[PDB]
Design a protein around this nucleic acid. Sequence first.
DNA 1: GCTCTACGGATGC
DNA 2: GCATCCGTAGA
Length: 599
Amino acid sequence: TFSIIDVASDRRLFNTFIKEWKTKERYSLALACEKREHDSDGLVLIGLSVCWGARDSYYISLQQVSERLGQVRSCLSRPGGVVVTYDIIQVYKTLVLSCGISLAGNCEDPKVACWLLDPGSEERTLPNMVTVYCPEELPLLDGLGSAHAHCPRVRAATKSVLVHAVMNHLTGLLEKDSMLDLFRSIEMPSQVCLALLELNGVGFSVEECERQKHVMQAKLTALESQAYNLAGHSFSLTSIDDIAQVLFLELHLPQFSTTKDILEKLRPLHPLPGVILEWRRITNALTKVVFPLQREKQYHPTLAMDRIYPIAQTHTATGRVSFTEPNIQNVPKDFEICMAFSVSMRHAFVPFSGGMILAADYSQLELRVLAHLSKDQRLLQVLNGGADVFRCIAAEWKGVDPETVNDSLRQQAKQICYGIIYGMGAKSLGEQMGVEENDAACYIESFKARYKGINAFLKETVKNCIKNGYVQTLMGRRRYLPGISNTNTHIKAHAERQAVNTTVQGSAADIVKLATVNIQKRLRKTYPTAPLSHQHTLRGAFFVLQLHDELIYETREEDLIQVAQIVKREMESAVKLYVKLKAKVKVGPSWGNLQDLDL
DNA sequence: GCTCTACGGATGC
DNA sequence: GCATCCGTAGA
Ligand SMILES: Nc1nc2c(ncn2[C@H]2C[C@H](O)[C@@H](COP(=O)(O)OP(=O)(O)OP(=O)(O)O)O2)c(=O)[nH]1
Ligand SMILES: [Mg+2]
């Protein structure tokens, strides 16, 4: 039955546990943390629990410790040897930040497996797992502590045995879905990479952020002065009611939806919608970036700099990775204040002293992925010759030379292309393009006619989703879309759009995770003596940010060239598609100041 | 009748 | 009285 052996109680017992632990091809590890403080070994993290089959759990107490932790480090760092933990990122970060132990080897996390089996479902707690997947272990839930009495050793042992059972069931479930090698070769190493990113943080100059904040606040005072002058009274710029009054009630064209439609037929008609738009953009910047970042900032003393530590979400409908605490991914790009000041929220994100930011983006990634999946011969030959499809779309749309395509113009062409691929209608295309309804419909017809393989892939993806109830990515991840067969046409169409989008975007996410893993492997081979993160303590790169197809690394100046070569090679060789996977590598003294490193 | 993500402020029942 | 909702930013 449910047993708790205390191996950290005798020399021979602990040594036998270690020598049996090394041989085991798969165990479950759990952390026992009595959190009187909210990162310390023997003060917060109290112990370690290890479970193999037959409802037995071995608890290693980290109280009194040097030799216990040394042998646990030896086994936990390359003892097979698969460690199963609930919330792998949390466990890895806690181990690093408390006792300086890095989980080296193959990891498994029942959370990641449950998300694999049904990514559109809810994040199941471990109890939630036991009730659903392992009902025969339900009597053990009384013993995962409680909100009042935890007993961290007993809670750890119960969680470890439950995680072992749950992952044993989920392993067979994943093999049935043919997602097991993908789980073990792609998904879990990506989890470790993300935890290592979370440990790294991203450098953050408070001085630069304070400078930007002061300029933005002076600009907001000026903007409020103009807005109260362009209207007449001192209304509220943060109230949609106080905006829909003054707007649409004196001379405008319409509650009333005072949204960024004030760009349309209002920005070129009255200057207050532009002033309101600028005020809203700077207010977004302040209240969603600089105020959160100035309160989320944390001083790294070893690096002698401030850093921001985001939390990776990773439980996503499509396999993407987002972040929680500051929401770093959505930090705005540069924009101009006239007083011309350049608000660069990314310019506040800086490397350590003597360091460089290295950012490697995937060139038109989902175009290439879709060209491979659809086998569209036209797109294959076009983008295998180094062409920029976004540039050519922008040129043929505007009639301008492709070489004279602006970066913002390229963004609109990119949005048009991806929207068309992902089920955008004629009305939305007309809005985003300026053309009429019929013109946008004919544009979509021409897009599907010249890229015949793309239309065939769209139809086949929807047909196979109806026939199977799910869609599959390039590397085998499935998403279930029960609305694909809904009688209501809106839910059915929504599921078809999600089917195509999930296929292509999940495949791109899979490629990006693979590239992250392979870059990490090559970096470890090239600089074996470097620290894994900024919390492990500088040679090589450090992976401070992930941008769904872009990997930010923060390398040393001397290692910049080698790191860029490594990153480019790994990103281009992640997957052998019918397309080439070109990566654009940029270097700079800051995230907001990056120059192309032609290499 | 583009998808995905989070998140501040405001509706909104 | 809080709970989502939505518009917003990235991608
Ligand atoms: N559905 C949709 N997906 C988008 C949109 N913008 C970006 N994404 C997805 C598709 C892109 O392939 C992917 C990576 O983002 P990027 O903006 O960097 O674009 P892409 O890689 O296509 O272009 P690039 O050559 O890097 O400029 O993100 C969008 O407007 N709609
Ligand atoms: Mg890209």
